[PDB]
Design a protein around this ligand. Structure first.
Ligand code: ATP
Ligand code: ATP
Ligand code: MN
Ligand code: MN
Ligand code: MN
Ligand code: MN
Ligand code: MN
Ligand code: MN
Ligand code: MN
Ligand code: MN
Ligand code: MN
Ligand code: MN
Lengths: 216, 344, 216, 344
């Protein structure tokens, strides 16, 4: 079984006016279909940085990141066709409704938006009957979960979840990471899930812990 | 343009406000353009009104024909058939109660005048009503016109030559008033010239005939200057404005980019949206122009055609699309991660 | 000992196009100096709504909210002079540095910004030497904690913290809610702290739990 | 304005772009204004150039004095001491090679002319060089001027009356050319009038004397029209623009409001910021105007004073402050909780 994502020996360095900051340091990661690898670490250890190159949101200062079965494609088309993002904050488009937050992804992927899949994904994340809400009529955790629902609308093979339960009561957190695990296995996804709720490791195949930009 | 179009329902006030500034600009253009096409007709409306296809002049030095320095001999008038001889002079007109300088055009008796002016060339003098008022004369009175006594045959409307209203008189009277044997200053051709000109003759299209008016040239500079700074400063101000507008979309565009939106996709969205708001604003500004303009032709000169309103409108709509393009190209140029640094 | 904040019998109802949503339902809350009352509940139960009227961020549809020793003042001056907000999301002003995020509050309160108090509050929340960072060079948890630090810059008597550890590893969460408790007691503050980390009740004097807009 | 000012260092590109559009607007005004103050002098520059304080006219009907219908009898010329008599006529000028109409002003011999024109009234005719070229004549030649032969005493610069350059001739020559016993058309007073006028006389300030020129009035309409639509459309377009600009600050303003920022505070911040960007843009647009304008006076008429550049600039700066005020008042009007609904 070949890996879905190879982060081969990869680093991120930022200019600090004069000096530098090594956000991520020689990351080596390989994730195979059906795997859900939790990511853990103290605030500001490289967790989001690792997801951002894993997501082709930026090229790594060094090393390479390769999604397989998408070799021979540009970064953007890769994201569009093969990756799902649960952004660290909800990043909802402020003029759409809850339902539209998801449909717009069908749209930009070039297919007629499926009003009914949207409604179902909205229900799984615990938001049935809220698909008409404007962003400003949603709570923080409600938003997180539209954000989550949006990630699940496509047919990706890599799923990147950046602390997707941060705003959820324990009950719902369990449901979410349960859902993540399920669609990971049902669909043989490679899933990277950042979290601080170390309890949730229970649902993860393996896990990478991070300090000072490195894996341990 | 899934997102672009729903931005508009989500915030119809914000977009009205932006269509306003685009419309207000189209207004300012459609207005000033026609106010300056106005001053321009203050030299040209009278020969315009006479609608000649070609107009044969006369120079001997092979030089640029000039309305001040050309004349048609009574025999010249036959080497061109289907032609009418027009006399153009500027002379003093004098009533008992006042005086002024004024343009005098001569046509052969019975020549029907432009409906812009109305009537027929009678014997004697046909005065713009505004000129008759100024002089305090009526049909039947006597005026001195170039030192000759002439009878006011009647009044008419006002077309213009070199910044004065034209007094319409018959060839013989124009000959008297301008002190010349010539039957006119130029010949008016309604069809096309089925003959060729001598070494000392020269046909002009009605566009060129303006070149022969001495006041036209020494001004055409000052009007094109306005017509130019208007379009320059404007197009720049538009391109700039649509740029700072579309730039309020960086965040939503950056999110869309991260999710995988192709740059064509995002350009289409941003253009399709601006398209709608621009189209609304030019349509609205070109409408209030025409109307508010047609509603002001007197007490103010204001010429405005259809390449003169639909002309700019298609120009702002085209330029506003550009300014949006500058903004989207700017966001989509960079790695989505950095753009989400704008997001806060 | 008189209460610092009386939320006397207070409700919030929002238009739902046609219908309504009763975000908060007849809330009764009274908090006394030195008290740290945790607030708990599932996602979308009224936790933030209760803080927003507690914060004079909106008038309640019904009932009254009264900060004592600030009676005879308008809403805004009340917030400016007597309340500290740790917003549910960081709400950092995007052209300021970490240090400036705090100094600007001295400024709008009308006093010469104290560059050194800022630096110290930044260190307590675990961000020493990061006071020059632009928002985009801070991690999610780093931002949360500038947000937290900013709340502590004033001389408030009511402190409203809306899930202030959502983005923090367990280690730092403990430190934060520890800090919250400390400055609450040191200064005889009334503190309302929304959280889902039920472990942290340990540091709270009492706590209100919420479901369907009501307290239980 | 802690935040307002650091927004500027944080994003100096964005603010350049906004100062551009404000400057580009100040440009368009400073330009068109002086291009139209240009056309205006095409009737007035010559008597302007002669700088009279008061100018005594002559009517018998107690009516509005008119340059076309007034004349000063040789005895009238003594009931006003410290006065000079000016003759204003429009007549045909004719050389061997060309002709034209042109304004002829008469002053007594030896009268020093405006430095705008240069020289002294000699006997005979002093021709604008551009007119001499057109006619193909030099000092010493002969022209017909109003049917009288007159000698070109020399050439001079060009001031203007009713849309033509003025030919400067001595009283006797002007009397010959205009066919009159009168010594002039009006009297020029350099000090103030230490005497009163008869039933048929009337003094005007130099501002009023323009009212007596027939071409001035029938145009002053068309120029004020431009001067007006320019300032209207402009001030609206500015007020609108600064509003959509300051509106990009809603979020940061809403955060500040929630923390406790008073509306004065937020207004001060928003005004202080716009103040700076506006001031930069008008300064820059009024600079490139003057320069680019002074650099274009010929081949194009362009009059521009200091109430004509610092005049608009203070007007956009004032109006742009308003448009920012409209935006801040809009955000600070509402309960901070709702504004943070804009935040997303
Ligand atoms: N654009 C940048 N410029 C400079 N330094 C940066 C930048 N982005 C991040 N950093 C620093 O890089 C480190 C990695 O940040 P990152 O967000 O990846 O950590 P994290 O563990 O994912 O964050 P958290 O757990 O607190 O949400 C942090 O220490 C942060 O201060
Ligand atoms: N402006 C609004 N219009 C309509 N409904 C709203 C509005 N704001 C909130 N709601 C609803 O009101 C309820 C209260 O939201 P609130 O954010 O107070 O809950 P919460 O428990 O604080 O949120 P969470 O724990 O998930 O962050 C939610 O059920 C939400 O759907
Ligand atoms: Mn490999
Ligand atoms: Mn992170
Ligand atoms: Mn929550
Ligand atoms: Mn280090
Ligand atoms: Mn005859
Ligand atoms: Mn009470
Ligand atoms: Mn909440
Ligand atoms: Mn975190
Ligand atoms: Mn309910
Ligand atoms: Mn004499």
């Amino acid at each position: 079984a070949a890996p879905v994502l190879s982060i081969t020996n990869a680093s991120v360095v930022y200019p600090d006016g004069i000096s530098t900051v090594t956000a991520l340091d020689s990351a080596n990661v390989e994730i195979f279909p059906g795997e859900l690898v939790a990511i853990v670490g103290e605030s500001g250890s490289g967790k989001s940085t690792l997801l951002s190159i894993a997501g082709f949101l930026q090229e790594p200062t060094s090393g390479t990141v390769t999604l397989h079965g998408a070799e021979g494609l540009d970064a953007t088309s890769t994201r569009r066709e093969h990756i799902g993002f649960v952004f660290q904050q909800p990043n909802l488009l402020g003029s759409l409704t809850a339902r539209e937050q998801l449909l717009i992804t069908d749209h930009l992927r070039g297919i007629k938006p499926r009003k009914d899949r949207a409604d179902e994904l909205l229900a799984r994340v615990g938001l049935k009957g809220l698909g008409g809400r404007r962003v400003a009529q949603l709570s923080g955790g409600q938003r997180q979960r539209v954000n989550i629902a949006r990630a699940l609308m496509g047919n990706p093979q890599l799923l990147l979840a950046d602390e997707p339960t941060s705003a959820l009561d324990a009950r719902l957190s369990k449901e979410i990471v349960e859902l993540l695990r399920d669609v990971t296995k049902e669909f043989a996804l490679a899933t990277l899930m950042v979290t601080h709720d170390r309890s949730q490791l229970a649902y993860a195949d393996r896990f990478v812990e991070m300090a000072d930009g490195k894996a341990l | 343009m899934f997102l672009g179009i729903r931005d508009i329902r989500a915030a119809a006030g914000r977009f009205a406000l932006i269509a306003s500034v685009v419309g207000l600009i189209t207004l300012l253009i459609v207005m000033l353009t026609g106010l300056t096409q106005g001053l321009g007709k203050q030299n040209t409306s009278a020969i315009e009104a006479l609608a000649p296809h070609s107009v044969v002049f006369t120079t001997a030095g092979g030089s640029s024909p000039e309305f001040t320095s050309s004349e048609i001999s009574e025999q010249q008038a036959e080497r061109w058939k289907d032609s009418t001889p027009l006399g153009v002079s500027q002379t003093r007109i004098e009533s008992d109660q006042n005086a002024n300088t004024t343009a005098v055009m001569g046509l052969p008796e019975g020549t029907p005048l432009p409906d812009s002016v109305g009537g027929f060339i009678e014997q004697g003098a046909l005065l713009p009503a505004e000129l008759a008022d100024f002089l305090h004369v009526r049909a039947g009175d006597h005026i001195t016109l170039g030192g000759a006594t002439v009878t006011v045959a009647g009044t008419v409307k006002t077309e213009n030559y070199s910044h004065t209203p034209v007094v319409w008189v018959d060839t013989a009277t124009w000959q008297l008033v301008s002190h010349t044997k010539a039957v006119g200053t130029v010949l008016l051709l309604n069809q096309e010239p089925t003959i060729q000109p001598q070494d000392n003759e020269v046909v002009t299209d009605l566009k060129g005939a303006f070149q022969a008016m001495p006041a036209y040239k020494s001004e055409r500079s000052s009007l094109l200057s306005m017509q130019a700074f208007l379009y320059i400063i404007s197009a720049l101000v538009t391109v700039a404005f649509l740029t700072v507008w579309t730039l309020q979309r960086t965040r939503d565009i950056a999110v869309l980019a991260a999710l995988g939106a192709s740059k064509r996709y995002l350009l289409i969205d941003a253009l399709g949206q601006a398209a709608i708001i621009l189209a609304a604003g030019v349509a609205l500004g070109a409408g209030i122009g025409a109307l508010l303009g047609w509603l002001i032709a007197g007490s103010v000169p204001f010429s405005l055609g259809w390449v003169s309103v639909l002309g700019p409108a298609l120009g702002i709509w085209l330029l506003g699309l550009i300014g949006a393009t500058i903004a989207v190209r700017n966001v989509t140029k960079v790695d989505p991660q950095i753009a989400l640094g704008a997001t806060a």
